[PDB]
Hints:
The structure is cut from a larger assembly and holds chains A, B, C and D.
Chain A: E1 9-11, H1 12-17, H2 21-27, E2 30-32, H3 41-48, H4 54-61, H5 68-85
Parallel strand pairs in A: 1-2
Chain B: H1 5-8, H2 13-30, H3 38-63, H4 81-90
Chain D: E1 4-5, E2 12-13, E3 19-23, E4 27-31, H1 34-41, H2 53-58, H3 83-111, H4 116-129, H5 139-152, H6 155-168
Antiparallel strand pairs in D: 1-2, 3-4
Bound molecules: zinc ion.
The structure holds three RNA strands.
PDB class: ribosome
Keywords: Ribosome, Ribosome biogenesis, pre-60S ribosome
Entry title: Cryo-EM structure of a Chaetomium thermophilum pre-60S ribosomal subunit - State Puf6
Amino acid sequence: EGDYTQYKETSAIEFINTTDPIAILANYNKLSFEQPPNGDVALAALEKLPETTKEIRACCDDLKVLGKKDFRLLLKWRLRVREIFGLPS
Amino acid sequence: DGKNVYDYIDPDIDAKLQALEEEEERLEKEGFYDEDEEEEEILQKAEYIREQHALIRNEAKMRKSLKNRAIIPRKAVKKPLSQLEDHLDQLGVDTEAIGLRA
Amino acid sequence: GSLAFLPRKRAARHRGRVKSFPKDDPKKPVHLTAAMGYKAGMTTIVRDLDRPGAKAHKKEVVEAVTIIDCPPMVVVGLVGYIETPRGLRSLTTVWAEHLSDEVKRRFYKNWYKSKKKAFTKYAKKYAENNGASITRELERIKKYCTVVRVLAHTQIRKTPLKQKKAHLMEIQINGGSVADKVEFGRSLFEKPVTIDTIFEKDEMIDVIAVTKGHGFVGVTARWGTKQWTVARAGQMGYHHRTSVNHKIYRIGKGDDEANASTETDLTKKKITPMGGFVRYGEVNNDYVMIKGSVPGVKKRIMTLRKSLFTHTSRKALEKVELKWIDTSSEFGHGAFQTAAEKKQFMGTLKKDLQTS
Amino acid sequence: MRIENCFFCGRPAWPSKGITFMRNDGKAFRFCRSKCHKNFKMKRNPRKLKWTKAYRKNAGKEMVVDSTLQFAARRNVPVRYNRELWQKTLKAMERISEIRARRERVFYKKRMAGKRAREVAAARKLVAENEHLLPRLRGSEKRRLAELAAERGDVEELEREELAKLASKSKAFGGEVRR
RNA sequence: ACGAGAUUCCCACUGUCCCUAUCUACUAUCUAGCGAAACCACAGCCAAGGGAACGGGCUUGGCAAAAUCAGCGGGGAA
RNA sequence: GUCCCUACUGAUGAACUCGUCGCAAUGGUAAUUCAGCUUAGUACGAGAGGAACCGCUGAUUCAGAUAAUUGGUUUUUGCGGUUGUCCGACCGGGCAGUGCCGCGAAGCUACCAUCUGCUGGAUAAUGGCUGAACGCCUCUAAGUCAGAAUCCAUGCCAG
RNA sequence: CGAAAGGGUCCUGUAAGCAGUAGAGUAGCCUUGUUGUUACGAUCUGCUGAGGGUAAGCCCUCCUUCGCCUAGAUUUC
Ligand SMILES: [Zn+2]
């Protein structure tokens, strides 16, 4: 109840900062890089990083068509970015 | 011809088509569409070497058997002179020497 | 099952007989009734529907059509029948001079080893002042017969078939006086009759053919199970059937070089699918595009005849407008209508550069 | 009445071909065949499979920048019907197609630019290491040619002519056993 | 608490079914050679009639055309 | 406490010289129900409500076909991946009564797909015309009109 | 007519081999390396929508190549 239209999006930073990355991947449709109304500097940084390649942006656009290798690649890229950004682990 | 007319329908297409024709003449001008015996004999010899390798492999595959059969040793079997005379001839050896051994 | 088709035996003949020509009155103009063609296969079309009162009105519909290869038939004879208290009786038949080798092949079982002399003495009847004999038979038909039929045979050298033995049949001449139709039949001798003259577009016809055989089959697939009225095992298939009310969607000319083109798509292509009709070949003659499915296997002789009665539906007398005709390969999941369209999509290949 | 493109491979999807999948988010996926449909249900990556346009575009096998391929796009603002406009559009399309293929031909040749240099370099290595497998005439042929040269009165040129003619012109297995 | 104990309920799966379709091997089929047995008064189409609710041979109708191959299960007192 | 003949379903067949094109005695017989649009918010009705003929379009059941398309099936052992063991390694392969997995043409199939199902005469109940019986009267007695998904045929199947 | 072959159409999915320090990793040489070197090196990339199969119940053949042919046996007014 309440999740009509069966569609949900977040920002990429939320996927980076979350404690449960598996929950976001399994329950959302799109990881967006759209600059927030205010303007997120982390989005600007994460967009311009060389780790996020064309394949990474392809998977984030459509989460419901991904497979085993694609999901693992997203988790690996999350860990690499968190190391750059100084997150705990 | 496998295309959608509605996809290409666009006003001012004459200007776009005219611009494309200019690009074609310029590209035909500077040389974007221009097409540019020792090597032939080397390749022919390389094919001959590869063909000989296949024939040698075919000869080896001919005798191999699928699973480890006991075989007659070469020293045990006896061979005709015609086969030895022929094979030596293909290798470029004069016959004059052989003919008196057996 | 149905007891109206009860003697589920193999058809006595491979060709199939009309068994009923439409009732004749002298008021209509002189015309032919039936024709022969060879089943080529099936293809998909898109039709701009114009059915007032239907859900798909003013909309595009995808339909399945069957293609029948129809080389022109050659009229080589004439037959006359008289009315008797015991039914119709053949009084006399008048053959034409100069019959072809194919139609003579029908008269022989071993044509290769035979001294081909069928109708050799009959030819002398025309050319040796025995034309009185030919005219006497023609006058006999005029003054004694009530139904006159035409013997026409196919031309299978044009068909991509290994068979060389043509097919004969009698086609009734309807609509006129007996004298008028006799002069009609004599004038048609030695002449090819094309399919666009017998039938035409957006008219509804009946097709007669022998169904596909299945051999000895049990009750499960023969009579459809979940004495004469009890389901048994026996022959299934190869049964003579007469299917009625099939609408002609197009008649192709073969020489047009744009048979499959419509006023909507401007692609110069013929009806033959990419790679050819599977197990048939290429249709290089006139063809009749019939809606739906029709009894018979591919390359089987097909008998087309007219409707016995004036139609009572709006499916007849309604115009058929075509948008696009499929030509992609039937040998697989085809996606290209023309050889050019495949090369444009995939670019150039390794063999293309090596050859060039 | 439109020609659609496959979601998986991008092949021309014509009417009554393939299958369409409707997702609860409100998106429709069009497939040209069961091969593409079954790969989609198994969650394979079209960008990784080598028989798809997604791989070919992303791997540099196809031209993605050009003036020709920008002419065609999906139009969301209808243009009022005009007979002259449609007729010249068809002529424009025909001109556009032959320019595209005759630009695509250069693209393929540029991709395979250095291929003969590698082939001859490998061929030079093979001959240098396997010189004993080259044609070598025959011992009887050398003798018979030597007498013919002696009778004529250029043995090296005569041998070369014989060597070439036999190379211009297969061995069986076993043979007859006398009964 | 325990039980290859029974029953009910819940989740999951299934050609059990809607409703069937396809595929493989051995048979079934044909040939060469070899080669029985059960059983057998004589036979073998149907209808009505043949008092003893009994017909296979009689009556009087329907009919009725050589010789064969495969399938089946309809018939042969208390 | 007792594998044969026939029937039926199919397939051949000697005699009539072989073949081609036909006729049609006889036998069987096939179509069914519902809905929607228009008529019409009309006739009818105080109101609430609320039809039908002509015309048009679908669907249920049944029947006969067909493979363009979609799905299913795979010994195409067609291509690819992979487990165990082996041919000394590579390449190429064997065996695991088709090792397992993915796709898979062709063929076969599916109201899981698609197509098609047709018109004359005579009647039953009943409603009538002219008109005796019976100086009224009466559809009946002589004569005669219409009329059911009925009957008989055509279309259809066999010959 | 038959057998091959070429082309087309479909199926699969990128062959064997060679090459690029792209390459994680495993080790020697000399002495410190701020850019030291030499070998092996799973994997990746290019040659390569390549390679393989294609009628057995797919399609075509301009001389694409090779071959076969007017039989032999019985019966019939
Ligand atoms: Zn696709």
